[PDB]
Design a protein around this ligand. Structure first.
Ligand SMILES: CC[C@H](Cc1ccc(C(=O)NCc2ccc(OC)cc2C(F)(F)F)cc1)C(=O)O
Ligand SMILES: CC[C@H](Cc1ccc(C(=O)NCc2ccc(OC)cc2C(F)(F)F)cc1)C(=O)O
Lengths: 317, 318
């Protein structure tokens, strides 16, 4: 599948607030589709989708989400609560003169596009998540309660400074370690809080996943030199704010065209978690990629492309 | 008509070759429209069109043309021959994944979009020029012939690199307050320039503020031209022989795509008359004509320009 050379892309910049600019990559003509990567990724994560969606007849905007790459990384933890992040994407649409977009998210980006679709449906022509379910907040169930102990690692991510040091230690190590097919996996997310690290019981000089080249790893590396891992990590550090915000919607369905794409071998965002999203989302269509781990876009680019274009052309165009 | 705050625009950047990026401002959704300013202007020259075209249902890309503002100003004179400038706009479309655009130009921008439409029609949905006619190159008539065949004598003053740069860079506020005037406010004679040895030599020291334009607006132009100065901009004038020999290599071939010529009654350089026989060369040409409009068409008569463009866009291009 045709990929992206960063040097050859149209680079877009939009100030959504005084010291906060959002960077995006833009390709194609037709309906606006806005791709929102997850943790700890990049617009480059969409390198296989961008050329295909443009060819399919769509105007693709591939974000650096706030904290990442060429998008500002404001120092305040509370800048990365979903509330702020969503208002800033709405301001993004306003400044580009877009009445709406299709929002397609993965991982943390998937949680953003669910919450755009929940609170700003008038601005979202249709919504799609890779891996990430939309589970409504239980107002009787606090977040620290919810940590589903697969999610214990989120506690290690809480204390500012701590996980930054691990992840910034050796950037090549970090990304070679993370960006693996599920069968190649070198770390257990279940173990993290105990071991006191993601990487403490993983190879010193990890090998290169079949999903990725050295050059692709060095691009991620080069990006995360700019602002590091604090910004990215701060998405984890607004559980109480996000919970209280999400509760303030409580009950209201998402009536816009919707797509949930599950990955058989994401052991964190497991297909099952998405099971009763129809109750909360009447017009939900489904994709499901077999032999696909967390890193859905680069694990199974051709599958992702065929599912998205099929749903786009049927539900959004 | 709603204008533009630069700080609030989406800013776009595209490398069309190693040391050469094009900057543009982007607003709206629907068919791609690409606005190409003239000399010596800016994307900001389209500040009254951009919000209106976006509102009208169009995706507007408002260029800094090569040499201007945030677009690269490569030092070589022949980088600003029409050939290169057009190839680079085609590369601009390629890198944005656009099969075509509507091209709307003014002045030198107008000459670019005529030549895009001539040599790259497959990439141009439809073409519109403000003020600038499309006169085919006569292969029996050299460029230096066409000029001193006379209103265009000032183009000779623009030739020698360094010379006109010094006048125009002397005092940027002076330059822009002096130029951006309604034709009744005019403080220049363009026909005099070669004689007097200057644009401004016989014009006020501290010129007054044209009714067309505010201090803020002038200071934006000023701020932009600090980046690269006037060499890049002026180098569009310095490729007459190259442009002539290039344009002759099209000789005869008509422009079969939807086209719009907009004449300004009071542009005394790009005069309505010059556009008179463009039908022969362009079968599908529709026409606008703005009364009481000088050279600086977009800011002189924003509401007229907007109504003509959107009418033609909606009828001929969408
Ligand atoms: C259901 C989950 C949502 C939001 C949400 C929670 C956690 C994550 C998250 O940690 N994503 C990163 C991740 C995911 C899977 C992995 O598999 C190996 C690894 C990672 C990680 F390495 F941390 F980047 C992403 C989204 C919620 O909390 O409601
Ligand atoms: C017919 C003209 C075309 C190309 C062409 C020639 C000249 C110009 C040009 O000098 N435009 C700038 C200009 C125009 C009118 C003016 O009236 C006050 C003043 C200017 C100027 F001050 F020079 F910027 C712009 C385009 C050709 O050569 O075929």
């Amino acid at each position: 599948p045709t990929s992206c050379n960063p040097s050859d892309m149209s680079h877009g910049y939009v100030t959504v607030k005084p010291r906060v600019r959002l960077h995006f990559v833009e390709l194609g003509s037709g309906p606006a589709v806005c791709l929102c990567h997850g943790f700890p990724e990049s617009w480059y994560s969409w390198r296989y989708q961008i050329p295909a969606l443009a060819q399919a007849g769509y105007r693709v905007l591939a974000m650096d989400m706030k904290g990442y790459g060429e998008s500002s990384a404001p120092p305040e933890i509370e800048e990365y609560c979903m509330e702020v992040l969503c208002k800033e994407m709405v301001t993004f649409l306003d400044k580009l003169g877009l009445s709406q977009a299709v929002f397609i998210g993965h991982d943390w980006g998937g949680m953003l596009v669910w919450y755009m679709a929940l609170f700003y449906p008038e601005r979202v022509r249709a919504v799609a998540s890779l891996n990430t379910p939309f589970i409504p907040a239980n107002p009787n169930m606090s977040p620290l309660e919810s940590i589903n102990p697969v999610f214990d690692y989120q506690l290690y991510f809480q204390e500012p400074g701590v996980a930054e040091a691990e992840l910034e230690q050796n950037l090549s190590r970090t990304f070679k370690s993370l960006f693996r097919a599920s069968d190649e996996s070198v770390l257990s997310m279940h173990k993290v809080c105990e071991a006191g690290g993601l990487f403490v019981n993983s190879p010193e000089e990890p090998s290169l996943s079949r999903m990725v080249t050295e050059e692709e790893i060095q691009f991620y590396v080069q990006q995360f030199k700019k602002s590091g891992f604090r910004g990215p990590l701060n998405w984890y550090r607004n559980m109480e704010r996000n919970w209280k915000w999400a509760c303030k919607s409580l009950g209201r369905k998402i009536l816009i065209p919707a797509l949930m794409v599950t990955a058989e071998k994401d052991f964190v965002l497991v297909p099952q978690m998405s099971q009763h999203m129809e109750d909360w989302i009447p017009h939900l269509k489904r994709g499901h990629i077999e032999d696909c781990g967390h890193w859905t876009q680069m694990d199974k680019p051709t599958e992702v492309n065929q599912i998205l274009i099929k749903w786009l052309d049927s539900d959004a165009r």
